[PDB]
C-alpha cells in the first residue's frame, strides 16, 4: 500500500498534457511506465480516461473528477482529493498505487507521493502542461537506468524534520 508518481518528460517541463500520451517509435518508456504500472490499482484524472475507456493499464481503474460520477466498468473508483484515494489504496492491499497525470492531479498529490518514477525521454518531442510546486534540493535520488531513448530516475525524499 505505498504511493508512487509516474511521468514523461519530452525536454519542456510537461507531466501528461491535461490527459494523452500520443508520442510512438518509443515503446521502452511504455516498457517501465507497464512493468511498475502491470496488474494493481492506477491513480489518474478524468481526461485521460476519455483514452482509457478500451483496455485499462492495471488491475483497479482510479479516476480523480471535479463533476463525480459513477462509472460503469468491472473494478473502477472516482477520487474527490487526497483521502478519497488514499483509504480505496489501504482497502485494496496491493504493493503500490500510481499517480499518471495530468498537471492539477499531480499538483494536490505530491504532498503525499513518498517515491517518484518518472521516465525522461530525450530530443525533439512536444509539450503543453507543466510541473506546479516541485521540490528541487529535497528530493533524494534511489537509483537512475540509462537507455538508447529514456532516462529513468527511482526518488526515495530528503526525509529530515520528522
Request: aromatic content about 8%; overall charge negative; cysteine-free.
Amino acid at each position: 500500500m505505498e504511493l508512487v508518481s509516474v511521468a514523461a518528460l519530452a525536454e519542456n517541463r510537461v507531466i501528461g498534457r491535461d490527459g494523452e500520451l500520443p508520442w510512438p517509435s518509443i515503446p521502452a518508456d511504455k516498457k517501465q511506465y507497464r512493468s511498475r504500472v502491470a496488474d494493481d490499482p492506477v491513480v489518474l484524472g478524468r481526461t485521460t480516461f476519455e483514452s482509457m475507456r478500451d483496455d485499462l493499464p492495471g488491475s483497479a481503474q482510479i479516476v480523480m473528477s471535479r463533476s463525480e460520477r459513477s462509472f460503469s466498468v468491472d473494478t473502477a473508483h472516482r477520487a474527490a482529493s487526497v483521502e478519497e484515494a488514499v483509504d480505496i489504496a489501504a482497502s485494496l492491499d496491493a504493493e503500490t498505487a500510481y499517480v499518471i497525470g495530468g498537471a492539477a492531479i499531480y499538483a494536490l498529490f505530491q504532498p503525499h507521493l513518498d517515491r517518484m518514477v518518472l521516465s525522461r525521454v530525450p530530443g525533439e518531442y512536444e509539450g503543453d502542461t507543466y510541473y506546479p510546486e516541485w521540490d528541487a534540493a529535497e528530493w533524494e535520488l534511489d537509483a537512475e537506468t540509462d537507455h538508447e531513448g529514456f532516462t529513468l530516475q527511482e526518488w526515495v525524499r530528503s526525509a529530515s524534520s520528522r
